[PDB]
Each structure stands twice: as structure tokens, then as C-alpha cells.
């Protein structure tokens, strides 16, 4: 997160951390007791998801649960066109129990509205190019479709949307991929990509436009 601040511990209970050998590489959103939503470009053969965290130090966070999973379903059209449909559902081995610091969030069924201010959180790089010790939070506003599509032509696709890009230099960044973007308490998008460096004025970040994959997310999680 660029130019944000330490989130209020456990203020985003749907936040899922994805760690590899021993480091964080992505995030996900608990959209169901046994399913974590994330960016297709975060696919692995097996994940080590951390729920209920705030600091990466799992054994320092109470209600925290380091579950495991291996069945991941990337969206059929991911990366066709280049970079598009960047979402993926990861099915957790053992379903988790919604605790005090671990709750799932629902996906917005309506589409981003320009100007609307939202929040995004993650453990990605900071304004100083450094990784944070706790989960970061920042607000960015939805940018209009016109500006988005022209700014990111010809890579822009309807499965994406822009947010931020303001003068305040608030934005996501590397390590926040698959992170959540909440709008009025709904999961509006996932941290997907954007120009580098991050936090450039006039250059918003791109997020997966979840409002567009409700039916798929459903047919998958359920059936
Ligand atoms: N700066 C950004 N909004 C960004 C950087 C890496 C990435 N995967 C996604 C987005
Ligand atoms: Co805590």
C-alpha cells in the first residue's frame, strides 16, 4: 500500500495472506467459509493461507489460523486478453469457522461508480519501497471508465477498473496483488496490476471488476 497507514487490527477480517517458502507474495479475500478469492496471477500448486492476521507473525496473533489448500480454479479466460479476467477461487482443505477476527465478506453485485471512495489493504511494498510489518489500509476513489480505458488502452478490458491515481499518491503496489478493494462494505475488486512505479499522479491502479464474475464465482463456489 502506498501512502496508507496501519489498519485497525482485525478491521478487515476477510483479508487472507498467501505465503510461500517463508514470505508473503499475495493476498485473497475470504468470500466463503471454504473459499478464498484472489488474483489469477497468484496461482500456485499449493497455498499456505493465513486468516485472522494483522502481522505476518502468525504466532503473535490470537484468532489467527494458518490453513492449507491446493485446489485452485483460475477463471477460464484469464489473461485473454493480456492481463484480463485476473481472478481465481482457492478451495481451502478444511472449511474455517467465522471467528471474531476472521469473517467472510460479500462480493458487490453492482459495478464501481466513479468518484466513489473505497478502501484497499495489503502487506505490499510501501511508499519507501519497504514491506510493512502490519496490514496496510488506504483509500482510493473509483476513476471513470472513460479515463480508465483511455489511460490503459489497449490493455483495458471490461473485467477491470481503475481506482486512485489522485494527487495524493495513494495506491496499491507490489505484494498487494489479490488484495481487497471494498466499497460501501462490499468486495468491489481485487488488486490486479498498474504502471510502475506505484503511486504516480494521474496513473490509477487496475483492479479486477468482480461485479462482472458473480455468476462464475457462484457456480464455482457452490457446484
Ligand atoms: N501500483 C499498483 N497499483 C500495482 C503493483 C503490482 C501489482 N500486481 C498490482 C498493482
Ligand atoms: Co491482534
From Swiss-Prot:
UniProt GO BP: amelogenesis; biomineral tissue development; extracellular matrix disassembly; protein maturation; proteolysis
Coiled-coil residue windows: none
Pfam families: Trypsin
InterPro entries on file: Peptidase_S1_PA (IPR009003), Peptidase_S1_PA_chymotrypsin (IPR043504), Peptidase_S1A (IPR001314), Trypsin_dom (IPR001254), TRYPSIN_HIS (IPR018114), TRYPSIN_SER (IPR033116)
Peptidase S1 domain residues: 1-217
Tissue and organ distribution: Expressed in prostate.
Broad class of the protein's primary localization: secreted
Keyword Metal-binding: yes
GO cellular component, one term: secretory granule
SMART domains, A to Z: Tryp_SPc
Domain of life: Eukaryota
Positions annotated with a glycan in the UniProt record: 139
SUPFAM superfamilies hit by this protein: Trypsin-like serine proteases (SSF50494)
Disulfide bonds: 7-137, 26-42, 111-211, 118-183, 148-162, 173-198
Binding residues for Zn(2+): 10, 61
EC number: 3.4.21.-
PANTHER family: KALLIKREIN-4, KALLIKREIN-RELATED
Family of this protein: Belongs to the peptidase S1 family. Kallikrein subfamily.
Illness: Amelogenesis imperfecta, hypomaturation type, 2A1: A defect of enamel formation. The disorder involves both primary and secondary dentitions. The teeth have a shiny agar jelly appearance and the enamel is softer than normal. Brown pigment is present in middle layers of enamel.
Designated name of the protein: Kallikrein-4
Species: Homo sapiens
Gene: KLK4
Amino acid at each position: 500500500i502506498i501512502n496508507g497507514e496501519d489498519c485497525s487490527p482485525h478491521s478487515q477480517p476477510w483479508q487472507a495472506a498467501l505465503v510461500m517458502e517463508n514470505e508473503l507474495f499475495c493476498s485473497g479475500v475470504l468470500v466463503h467459509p471454504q473459499w478464498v478469492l484472489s488474483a489469477a496471477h497468484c496461482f500456485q500448486n499449493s497455498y499456505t493461507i493465513g486468516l485472522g492476521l494483522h502481522s505476518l507473525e502468525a504466532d503473535q496473533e490470537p484468532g489467527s489460523q494458518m490453513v492449507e489448500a491446493s485446489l485452485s480454479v483460475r477463471h477460464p479466460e484469464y489473461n485473454r486478453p493480456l492481463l484480463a479476467n485476473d481472478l481465481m477461487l482457492i478451495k481451502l482443505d478444511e472449511s474455517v469457522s467465522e471467528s471474531d477476527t476472521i469473517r467472510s465478506i460479500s462480493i458487490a453485485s453492482q459495478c464501481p461508480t466513479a468518484g466513489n471512495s473505497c478502501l484497499v489493504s495489503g502487506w505490499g511494498l510501501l511508499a519507501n519501497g519497504r514491506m510493512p510489518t502490519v496490514l496496510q489500509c488506504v483509500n482510493v476513489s473509483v476513476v471513470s471508465e472513460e479515463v480508465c480505458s483511455k489511460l490503459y488502452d489497449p490493455l483495458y478490458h471490461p473485467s477491470m477498473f481503475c481506482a486512485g491515481g489522485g494527487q495524493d499518491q495513494k495506491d496499491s503496489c507490489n505484494g498487494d496483488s489479490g488484495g481487497p478493494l471494498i466499497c460501501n462494505g462490499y468486495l468491489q475488486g481485487l488488486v490486479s496490476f498498474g504502471k510502475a512505479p506505484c503511486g504516480q499522479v494521474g496513473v490509477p491502479g487496475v483492479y479486477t471488476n468482480l461485479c462482472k464474475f458473480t455468476e462464475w464465482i457462484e457456480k464455482t463456489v457452490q457446484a
